[PDB]
Design a binder for these strands. Sequence first.
RNA 1: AUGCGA
Lengths: 230, 47, 59, 83, 608, 201, 229, 105, 172, 284
Amino acid sequence: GVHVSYDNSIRDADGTLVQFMYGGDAIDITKESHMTQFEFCLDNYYALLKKYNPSALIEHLDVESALKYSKKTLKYRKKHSPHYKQSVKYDPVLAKYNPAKYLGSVSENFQDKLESFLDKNSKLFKSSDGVNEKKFRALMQLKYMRSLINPGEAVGIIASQSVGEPSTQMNVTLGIPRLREIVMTASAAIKTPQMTLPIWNDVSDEQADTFCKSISKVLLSEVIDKVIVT
Amino acid sequence: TTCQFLTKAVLDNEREQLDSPSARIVVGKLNNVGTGSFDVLAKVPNA
Amino acid sequence: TATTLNTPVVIHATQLPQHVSTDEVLQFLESFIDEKENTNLSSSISQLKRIQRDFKGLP
Amino acid sequence: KAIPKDQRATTPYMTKYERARILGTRALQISMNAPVFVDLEGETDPLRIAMKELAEKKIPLVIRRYLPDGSFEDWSVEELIVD
Amino acid sequence: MDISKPVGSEITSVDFGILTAKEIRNLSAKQITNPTVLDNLGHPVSGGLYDLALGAFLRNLCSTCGLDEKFCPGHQGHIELPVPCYNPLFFNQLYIYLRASCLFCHHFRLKSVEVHRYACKLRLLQYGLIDESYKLDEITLDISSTLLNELKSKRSEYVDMAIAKALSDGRTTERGSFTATVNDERKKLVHEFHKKLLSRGKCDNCGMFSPKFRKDGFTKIFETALNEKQITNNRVKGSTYILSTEVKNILDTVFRKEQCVLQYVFHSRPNLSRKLVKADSFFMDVLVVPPTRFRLPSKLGEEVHENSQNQLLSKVLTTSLLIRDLNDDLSKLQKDKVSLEDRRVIFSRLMNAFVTIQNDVNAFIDSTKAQKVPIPGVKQALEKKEGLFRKHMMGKRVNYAARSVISPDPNIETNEIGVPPVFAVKLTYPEPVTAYNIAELRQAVINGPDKWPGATQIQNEDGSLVSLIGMSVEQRKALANQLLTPSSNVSTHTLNKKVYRHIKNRDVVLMNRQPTLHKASMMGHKVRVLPNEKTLRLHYANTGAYNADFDGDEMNMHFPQNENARAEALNLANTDSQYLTPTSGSPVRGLIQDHISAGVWLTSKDSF
Amino acid sequence: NENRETARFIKKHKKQVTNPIDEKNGTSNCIVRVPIALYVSLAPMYLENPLQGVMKQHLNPLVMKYNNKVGGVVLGYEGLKILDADPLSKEDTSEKLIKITPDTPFGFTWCHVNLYVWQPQVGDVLEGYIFIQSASHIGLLIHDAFNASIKKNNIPVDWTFVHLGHWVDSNGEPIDGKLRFTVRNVHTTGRVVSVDGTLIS
Amino acid sequence: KMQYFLSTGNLVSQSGLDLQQVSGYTVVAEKINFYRFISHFRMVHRGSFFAQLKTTTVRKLLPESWGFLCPVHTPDGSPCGLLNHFAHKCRISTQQSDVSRIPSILYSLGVAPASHTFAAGPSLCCVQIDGKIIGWVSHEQGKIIADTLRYWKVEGKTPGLPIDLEIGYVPPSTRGQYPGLYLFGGHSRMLRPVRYLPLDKEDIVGPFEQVYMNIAVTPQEIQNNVHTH
Amino acid sequence: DRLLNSSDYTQASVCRECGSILTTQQSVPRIGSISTVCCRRCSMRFEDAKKLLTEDGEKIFIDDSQIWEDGQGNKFVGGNETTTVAIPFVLKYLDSELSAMGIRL
Amino acid sequence: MYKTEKVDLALNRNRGDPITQHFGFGNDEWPKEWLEKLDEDGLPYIGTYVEEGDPICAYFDDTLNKTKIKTYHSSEPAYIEEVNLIGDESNKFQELQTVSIKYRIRRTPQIGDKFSSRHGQKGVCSRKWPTIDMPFSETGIQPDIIINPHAFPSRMTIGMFVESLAGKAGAL
Amino acid sequence: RPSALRNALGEAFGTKKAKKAIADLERNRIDSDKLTDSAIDIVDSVRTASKDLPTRAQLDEITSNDRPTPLANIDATDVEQIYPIESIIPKKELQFIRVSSILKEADKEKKLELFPYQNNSKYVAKKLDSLTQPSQMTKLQLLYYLSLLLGVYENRRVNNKTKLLERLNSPPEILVDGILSRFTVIKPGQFGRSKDRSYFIDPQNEDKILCYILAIIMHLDNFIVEITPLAHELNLKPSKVVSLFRVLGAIVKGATVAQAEAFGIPKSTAASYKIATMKVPFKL
RNA sequence: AUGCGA
Ligand SMILES: [Zn+2]
Ligand SMILES: [Zn+2]
Ligand SMILES: [Zn+2]
């Protein structure tokens, strides 16, 4: 029952919404592979410009509304580039503009990596024929819009097979029994329930060994040498 | 446990809204996913 | 003649019928017959003209 | 259920699934003697003919995109960017 | 299927609900009464299991439809169960509801206003008003009848307010409110409801001491004695087996006296049907009779195997008729026979008979509810490992399909599949004939079914089928000049003829391997008829997507019959749409073995 | 309750009107115009004659034909209206829209049309031109369209035979031309529509 | 009735023959290949009921099977490990013999008769013959009897001592198998030849005694004071 | 197309007034009557029918058992898989039902 | 490939008021082209080519007053190897109601047939390569079988390599 | 002994013993006596509930049953009066079957022009030899009836009136109408009638007709029928002939000395020579 | 089910 609504939200065939975006970005795995290989795409810039020629499409939508959000939020977000003290005044652009309609509505993680690439490639920008970060960035955004997951894609099933099929190739429970222990039974009784504890930078290794002994359970049996009942 | 779900369904007087892809298969209905996520109509000349 | 491709699934009136006068009947007949003449239905049309003649007085 | 034209908010592009269904249904129509609005240009496969009709957007079909509420947007082929 | 035969009455939803014996009697095509099945070793017993009212048989027409075995859809008869019994399917339920009553008042032993409390919650959850469902608990105040009625007033007012708001706000509708969370809140509520229902170990509304109820498991309920402290307390308030009949007579009255709450207790959504909640819902006063069409014996090649239903049903008729005959024997004793304890034994026959019939009907439902490897009942028919649903609904056999061991072929496209001419001559496409395909179909007809781009059959536009299986070149020649004939019936003037043409180099086909581990393992390939082949030819590039190897692996070839499925098999399922896996998006399709060593050798700087 | 179900039988099986004799000298106004809603299929081949498509498809075979629901022989149709599948066209648009099946190229539509129906009832007094005269019935033809026959059993013994000979009326003169009769029944279980007249009421 | 049971393989009786299943006992000789025909008669099954088991320790090839079950003749699929195959040199005892004379020789060898022994424990070796407990000795006498027994086995002068007797010696072992000298001569023993070096002649060994026996695999690997065969 | 259209696809009768696919029957024809689809729930016993408090003309249909009925002429045909019909076999025994929806009702 | 058949005339053996079915004819009206396959005793000529649809025997039941035949229902043609008349273990049965017919189905090596070395390196025959197109050695021969080397790196069927070099030496 | 068995059980298993004991608990006293009285009242309720169905079997045998037969006269004091001619040949048709011309006609060919049916059967040759007196007119009428039934049986595969008519010799319409109405399942209808009268004879009707035929032979043979020769003559299954004769209630067994002598069959084959007979005390 | 191809 789990599929993509036309609004990009993940709803069940019941109608119950499960996620508001696929992985929170609505990106298709079958597209992503090169979606973050910017330099290569650039070496084949003119070809991709021939695929995603914008002049056919630049007439049907807006390339600024999201870019405007990018200006106010990109400023304040670079101002807030501590985690729980978030830029709560600005949700990500994917919340504020249909990624299919205003080119530039992209995960902030992808936006940031892309800009940082454009800055780190000013020397590639000293190797181009004339390409600029607005023309290349515009192209890569258009790759992003054209890489989005289609309305109605059976992504629930796709997920499920993507977990089953590779699990055929298969101190704590690993592999299939572990996945079973989670996915299949949601067992409140792990076979090897563990809790990882970060120890402060100041915590010496010897203090840590003292604490390791100091926390472990100690049964009376553990100290008993001999019991004689007469 | 098909019969168990049968019992709880009848006792509820449940109505199937025919959403499950499987359930819809049971009734021989175009699946609602993908190409069945929508309907197609036709534009016809009125004059 | 047994299925949808020839016969409507369902027919329902939305109000109580209206009792067309002889003159309204004749005006409909003349307009309908003329529009149809302008196909075994023609034979029923042949009967409609006789009805028209009977709605004229005499076949 | 009628989503106002002023209010249509969905992807201007034809989904792969929408395009697929359109091509099937229109092909099926021509194959059931729907009047072809494009040059047959020799072709005999109704499916490739419907593909020609898509290339010219001569297709006279409309997509009803449903929203899980049940509201829908009636879109012409002649506007949704085919690809 | 034919595209030429549309329907426009599609099912939009499915309501579930209990039948009723009077409904069955009105619809029932017949009552089957005779425990005989066949007679004189070979004849269909009148008004028995194989009465023609239950469908057509042996060239005998359906006595309810007069239709042949190949035509009569069949009709469902019915059995009038002597005494009322217990429905296995709800037996746990009726036991629960039995434990909830008062035996001197015949109400639920739970506080009436608290009950009303429940009814309120279940009404709000018909509309799924969850926040209000939690908000009801706040209504608060020896407790006067004026005060208990004041709680009933505030609660009813609360119902009216939450409804008036939600209906005003359109936050629900006349049709109720239905969501997954509403269902869950119902299961939790109905559970806490049942726990409070169980808490009363004596009546509160009436103070009465209900007996402890014991059960055998599926055929008897017993009514336990009480303690003299409770008995004498009953004086101031002034284990035995009981039949289903007494259970029905008590529970009916209890179920009516608490109909006002139970009305909302037994529906998760608004009872638009104004359905009375009847105790006869858990009991079977009658038994239906399925169509014989669906009760035919399994004859596989020579062996005729009896139907298991015939056997269990004959067991029901024998037991029931014996019990009716015992009822005749007491109707004999019953003049008066003042001291003939002789019946003290036929009365043992009555008790034994009664448990017997109940258990045997149970057996008719579920073998695992009766008392070595007995014929399966409907519960066994529906589940085990397939559940009629899994074995014939969630998966089926299919037509237009072939299976064969695959053989490699590198010279075909990577998107094609090599079809051997046996399969190329035995698979057809239902081609509507036009002015644009008249030439091709006229030639295919000329070839006939036993040649290349040929055709096995011709379906007229009148609906009739004309097989070309044995027609001569002359006969096919005559039909070729008739493929484009004019209309004949205005009933059919809109259609055009169809030709069941062989599969050819322009068709798409859906190849599926064994372990359907992922959707990428079942793709559509473009058909390429290969001469002088007998095995499915496949390009190597696909074998790492099927996880296939020519060791002996066999593949299913599906030929879709429809432009919707053709367009999907040429555009979506097609190999080109499968260059990446959705698991990871790494390409799963590339050259293999020898081609790899060939690239390593050819691309060496040493290669001139 | 048992009167909801009797309300179902009388109120569902109720008859609307009893078409009277015009001026009590004509015929019963069994001809009536009724606006309906029908549900028809549309082939693709009528994409250039869609209103006429529906006509040729469904409405043309319906004329001169009995409909159980309307209770009579369709006298003609008026005002076909395709219900647009998509709102706003003060019903008016150079093109309409229709739902296509999710399996076939066929369309399904709502339609609103006025019907011209011949809705006779039992007891109506009608006049007919004698079709035939056999010793068990009198054949007549209503409007030159509807065949009517009055069988011997429903005829007054006061009628007079003259020999398949000839009938002489109750007055004592042989019948000729037109006959005035009351409708006893209308039969429709076969080939074409049907009827039944009486001379005793 | 035996044609029916033998035609279905559903052997059923009021005692159940002390067997875990009522099917699968019969197989079609399936002569599609002479290899298959001979393969049928050296195939042995662990039984259907262990085929039903979910685990694999039953399927695990154990080293005890050396010389008795084939390490490579095993089907692939559900039966894997369930359908074992006998070694081409394996034999099956079909009779029992001269067990009556073995007590006499043991008594001569120093076994105390169980009425006289009056002792029992892991601290002492129990000499048993076919599940007839005949006596107790020191564990040292356990070893002396085992080896001298093998000498009188390979010898030809003690007819009360059939060549095919299996000499189960169990030495004393910390938490080991409970000690004893369990001889067996009865039916269904699996027996296989090995070459006894001290008398340079063939000797029949079964899988029980093999556990504690040092059998060199070839003459050049015979380790001093270790491999007896 | 695969799990239906090419397997057990059947255009089957359902009662537009009952919503069931197993009460449906072909009514028996007569000297003046063709075969007509009837729903068993939607018919009246010719022995009753208010006859004491009470005809359309065309609501009487006859069974192969010669039984006259009033009504039952409101059922139609819909595309489903034949196994669906197989379900009433078990389910109708199971004391449940289909309310097979359609257009207006 | 041999397929053996039992042709029984005692399907219902039935009470025992009759048991007359006899191989042969009576009405003459049968298609005399059946003699092209079935001898005047109702049994096919041993050696006969049989194809799907061909009559495998002809018999006569007095109840039907008809000469009936058992049709052959198979995917492939065969040849009749033996026809065996069974009167044995019977009390009288002289009417010859049981006949066993053996079919000989020739099986040519064909694309899709499985082949294996003695090393479990199994493969279907992908194609029957033209002799001219095969590779020919300087000894003037072209191999019988070609196995792809790329199978070995996973299988490590090196015993097969030694069998190749041993069979070559041992032939020479 | 069961109790003792229980003791054995007690020793063997605590748990299993518990289960059996539970069974005992389930039984309890079973019929309680006070409970029994209440139950009796319930039985009265059952009386109302009870499916007052009928005699079950007597009614079925009397009425339509495994195969229909002519109406037997259970009170007949002579076998010939069990199935009178009017039961074999309906009164309405019997009054119209006048065979006087057949008795008076000496020429076999002219008699053939008088027969309602002509076929390949030897029956007419067999019965004709014995019908020489006018007193046998009734017997001759029965001969007429077999001929008519034979025409029906051999053409039971005919599915329309005209094709059936093609096999008969201008038989009285009343005979065809009666046979089709009560011994066949007519597909009724004026729609079919405008083209022709179409119909079919189902297997149960075929069984009925065959029973009527055996009834005819039985009457003309004074209720003593040779099984073997009849089966051979009619091309019927031995099991079918036996079953059908038993439906009529005849006793079929090996010939008596008198029967063997009269029929001229070896006494040694008498036990294998099946004869059908009818007696005074009617069959149950 | 026994066995088996993958
Ligand atoms: Zn039927
Ligand atoms: Zn109470
Ligand atoms: Zn209904």
